[PDB]
Amino acid sequence: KVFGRCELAAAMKRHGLDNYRGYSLGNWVCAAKFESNFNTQATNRNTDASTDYGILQINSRWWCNDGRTPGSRNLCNIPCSALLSSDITASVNCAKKIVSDGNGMNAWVAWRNRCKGTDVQAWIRGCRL
């Protein structure tokens, strides 16, 4: 499912991401935008053979199990395919664990590189939240 900007913002808010761990909603929407372009089915394989899954491009080396990643830890205790669902609940619960891991949203390279320090409020502008 390819989400609309305001649509995703509302679902993320409903799921308790607005200001979760200090990061406003604009940060999460911006992150999803550059990580997956709002597409729940996005996947990207990496050089270390792990793969990033879903709307927030969660990695198979530590967060989920895809059955094909060397030394995966599966911290979110879920099969990676669950992150591709049209229902973002699994992705949100796992992202909450990742962002709490010590490095905050810097865990998401696209966030650090394209969202960090920018006017993230623009991502929820015009939405009825």
From Swiss-Prot:
Protein location: Secreted
E.C. number: 3.2.1.17
SMART domains: LYZ1
Main location: secreted
Pfam families: Lys (PF00062)
One of the record's GO cellular component terms: cytoplasm
Tissue-wise expression: In the egg white and polymorphonuclear leukocytes.
Biological process according to GO: cell wall macromolecule catabolic process; defense response to bacterium; defense response to Gram-negative bacterium; defense response to Gram-positive bacterium; killing of cells of another organism
Catalytic activity: Hydrolysis of (1->4)-beta-linkages between N-acetylmuramic acid and N-acetyl-D-glucosamine residues in a peptidoglycan and between N-acetyl-D-glucosamine residues in chitodextrins
Annotated C-type lysozyme domain residues: 1-129
Cysteine disulfide partners in this protein: 6-127, 30-115, 64-80, 76-94
Amino acids binding substrate: 101
Keyword tags: Allergen, Antimicrobial, Bacteriolytic enzyme, Disulfide bond, Glycosidase, Hydrolase, Secreted, Signal
MF GO annotations: beta-N-acetylglucosaminidase activity; identical protein binding; lysozyme activity
Active site: 35, 52
Coiled coil spans: none
Miscellaneous section: Lysozyme C is capable of both hydrolysis and transglycosylation; it also shows a slight esterase activity. It acts rapidly on both peptide-substituted and unsubstituted peptidoglycan, and slowly on chitin oligosaccharides.
Function: Lysozymes have primarily a bacteriolytic function; those in tissues and body fluids are associated with the monocyte-macrophage system and enhance the activity of immunoagents. Has bacteriolytic activity against M.luteus.
Subunit details: Monomer.
UniProt similarity note: Belongs to the glycosyl hydrolase 22 family.
Annotated protein name in UniProt: Lysozyme C
Species this chain originates from: Gallus gallus
